[PDB]
Symmetry: C3
Subunit: 100 residues, 3 copies
């Protein structure tokens, strides 16, 4: 299981969500953050997208976020992939990919 963490330009959230929804992703968690980088504004507002995804889906998810969030201009952001050891759905107690 993977935690896909994307830092993107805020106006790209909707496009990112449509791309994810089309892939059948059932949900995601979004934070407002401050991004320091080479893009000239010493920071710009960014949006952090965190979505837990199965091993069989994570590569397509990364690709879809990348395509949807890309403008070709400096500041577009990063996608980091971290591994998730265990996952639980709080409501049902389902685990692993059933928790997603």
């Amino acid at each position: 299981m993977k935690l896909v963490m994307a830092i993107i330009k805020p106006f790209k959230l909707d496009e990112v969500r449509e791309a994810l929804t089309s892939l059948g992703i059932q949900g995601l968690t979004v934070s407002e953050v401050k991004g320091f980088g080479r893009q000239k504004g010493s920071f710009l507002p960014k949006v952090k997208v965190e979505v837990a995804v199965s091993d069989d889906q994570y590569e397509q998810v990364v690709e879809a976020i990348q395509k949807a969030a890309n403008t070709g201009r400096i500041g577009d952001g990063k996608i980091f992939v971290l591994d998730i050891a265990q996952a639980v759905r709080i409501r049902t107690g389902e685990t692993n990919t059933e928790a997603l």
Copy 2:
């Protein structure tokens, strides 16, 4: 060492904290986030993100405590994810590994 990350309904935070304190967990970090899921709002709902680093010998009990504390049985209760922490340091003391917690 584990980073236990829980996305919960905001009104469950106090119970979650009390459950963690009851297990001797000395602290935790909390963020306000927007949760997109099946629960209806209007696309997202406010959620709380709880991040707590815990030792290997405590993490299972922590995950259970959070699950029980944050459960309502209604849609939108959220998720708990367990990530592995390679190293940890307490800034004030330089303590590392479980001593950092």
Copy 3:
């Protein structure tokens, strides 16, 4: 690759940034968070710094954040190091350390 996640006192952000800049660390992602701990006010505002860094630099980064963020008073916070499986720069498709 490592994700270095530091939870620090808000007034230490500038010191932490400048220390990282000295290491040629380009960017970083900053979040406003609430910290529950032994420090007495409930919670206190903290700053979460997330910086992805190469294996050959992460220890120096951890040291630099620790030295910069330390006051010796309760509430200074924590640094956690998590391993990053993959990383992509959205703008270019660059991966691994080139993504940083």
